[model samples]
Target: MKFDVIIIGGSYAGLSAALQLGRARKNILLVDAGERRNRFASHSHGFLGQDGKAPGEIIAEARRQIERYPTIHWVEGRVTDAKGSFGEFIVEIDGGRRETAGRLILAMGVTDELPEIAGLRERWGSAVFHCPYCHGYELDQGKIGVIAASPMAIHHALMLPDWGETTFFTNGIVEPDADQHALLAARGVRVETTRIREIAGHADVVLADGRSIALAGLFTQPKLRITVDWIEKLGCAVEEGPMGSTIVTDPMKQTTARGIFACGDVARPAGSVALAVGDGAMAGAAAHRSILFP
Candidate 1:
């Protein structure tokens, strides 16, 4: 089947994109593998009106709303391979099925590589998180702990003081300079140099020396992994940053390769539901305009 556009990754971003194109009466296909980056999170925060709602619930509602337009087709599968050029793109799904489209929007999100800490993975999105804005306010001005995975964590440690009484755990991975120490001390942030043994019981930091400090919430910076090899194979430009590699796109969300666009976490260094939805809306409109002009 031929579609006006094929949007990969039916999360917040892809759904928002599909919404715009569908309303414009354009035939579009949305393909998803059901792997949302925030699937581990129970409640999503800081997305304006949708704050405190379950992430799955918001996605389900968005999908339902997008299905109201007859021009949109939803597929529950992965795009194993994609090739061809502008206005003549072919996408292979799950190794067998093939679909053709004039344009493609890659919204497939990035994967986070968390530190190898015991009991941390299970508590992620609950007591442990990456974004302080998304999960910080819920801590209620209580004790907060920031575990340093790399030097970038200093930024995380510095920004979290507003959310709660903050502690910076060096974990023997990063050592702050004299100036950084003064800044942290000025912010009233307590710095702990002892390595972390593990996490236990609602954000408790277990020290290597057998001491445990309880915290309201813990934050850490996770390395990102973007697994869409086809983006590079198709010759889309990618930029490597301190966090990870991201597909390069213009202000309109169109990739360097014509007829190919990207949005959400795969394109931006930082992301949230609110930002991803906004990006998708722009990408969808830009793609629709391209179809008209081309």
Candidate 2:
């Protein structure tokens, strides 16, 4: 009926928090809807020991380990509504199950909106990706294409030349001034102004003008935004990121609302799995201390 903390997401951040609380001998309930942002990506990389592992494998292993603590309870439904206040709050799931918790951790992550190009969505995470560090190592020495989704596209084009022969495709979305163009040129980045008609086999990008460019992979940064709406309604403060609004938290990960904390993508800009895990651990610790010290 009640728990010390109710975690709203069970992915990296939520699971990391739950592990901390569970080990502290706190009765914690972690609820997840099972949808992850990286579900499309066949393999996740750059997490120290977990490099090259599939995202599902990482989470499955994490869940198995976290649930070993008798104090942690798991739920499979979405938290549709939450109410009450610090140390005495109610969480409602979609199935009408209602439970109470002394504190809450919101790890509901974010969604990425890629540019609208036919077939691009299908190749996302496999051949089309966002971060270079996360995916660049596997694609080194290969021709990489950078799609201009926003002004930030230039940043990607500039950084990717070392990894491969990079081409900056304007894609009709961005304009680089004279100096920016010169900088791109100086970096050995080719500029393509053609509109992308479709993404095809093996990362082949077809232009509206009938030219097709084959690439080892396409580099793109998706527009980011928080996936859930309840954070604002819960009265948590927000700060803007490069592409989305992020839930603001202190060093301890406490939100503007008492007894509420957030981590992972909601608390940061586009970040890595390693960073999310660390953030969640901090949040879990802070939530426990707030309960004891309050």
Candidate 3:
């Protein structure tokens, strides 16, 4: 079957994009693998009006709203492959289903690569998190630690003092420069150079030297990558972001590959739900315009 648009994800960005196109009465197909990046997170915050809500709750509500439009079809399956070109592309789903669309919106977001620290996995999204803006206030005025994962680790440590007494763990290779060290000290942030052996009891980071540092909350910027190979298979452009790679798109969220567009974490890493929603709106509108003119 042919659709006006095929959205490859059903998260905040995908749902938002569908909402716009559906309102325009465009026949849309939303294909989702049913897994979200925040699936591990118990609660989502910093999103106005949806703060302190469970991630699943937010997604469910968004999906409910988008389904109100009869023009949208939801497919709860992974896209095995996507090929062809503008105005006549083919998409293969996991269940031996095939679809065709006039334009494609690649909202298939990215996945995060967390450190292989023991106990970190168990405590993720509750006691351990990535973003300060999203999880900071919940841990404010408490003891917090930042594990160095990238150049942004220093930045994460620097911004954390406002939330609590901060500890900057080098994680073995993130020594701050002279000025950065001075700045950290100036903010009363303790610097730990020892490598982390593991997360102990989901409360402390056990050092290789057998020392354990207690923390009310821990922070680390996980590496992120595109969740699927569909975009690259279609020859869409890509660029490197701080955490990992992201699909390259223009001001209107149109991808380098004609008839392709992207938004949210797929386009840029370290974005919030609010940002994703806004991008979705733009991408959806731009996609609609493409169909209208073509």
Clashes of each: 0, 0, 0
Task: Return model 2's CA RMSD, one decimal.
Answer: 1.4
Local distance difference test, each candidate: 0.92, 0.89, 0.88
Candidate with better TM-score, 1 vs 2: 1
lDDT of 2 by residue, 1-294 (tens): 789999999999999999999999998999999988889888999898999999999999998888789999999999888878887988889959999999999998888888899999989889999888888778868999999987688888899998899988999888899999899989999999999999999899999999999999998878778766566667789887556678898888999999999999878876789999999999999988987898
Superposed model 1: Cα runs more than 4 Å off: none
TM-score of each: 0.97, 0.96, 0.96
> Per-residue lDDT for 20-119 in model 1, tens only?
9999999999999999999988899989889989999999888888889999998999999999999899999999999999999999989988899999
Note the residue pairs that clash in candidate 1: none
By lDDT, is 1 or 2 better? 1
Error of 1 at 31 (Å): 0.2
Which 10 successive residues of model 1 have the least lDDT summed? 226-235
C-alpha lDDT (0 to 100) for residue 240 of candidate 1: 80
Candidate 3 lDDT tens digits, 1-294: 799999998898999999999999999999999888888777888788999899999988888878899999899999989998999878999959999999999888888888888888888887888998888887758899999988778888889999999998998858788999899999889999998998976569999999999888899989888866666679898887667889899999999988988998989777889999999999999999999987
Can you give the lDDT of residue 4 in candidate 3?
92
The order by descending TM-score is: 1, 3, 2
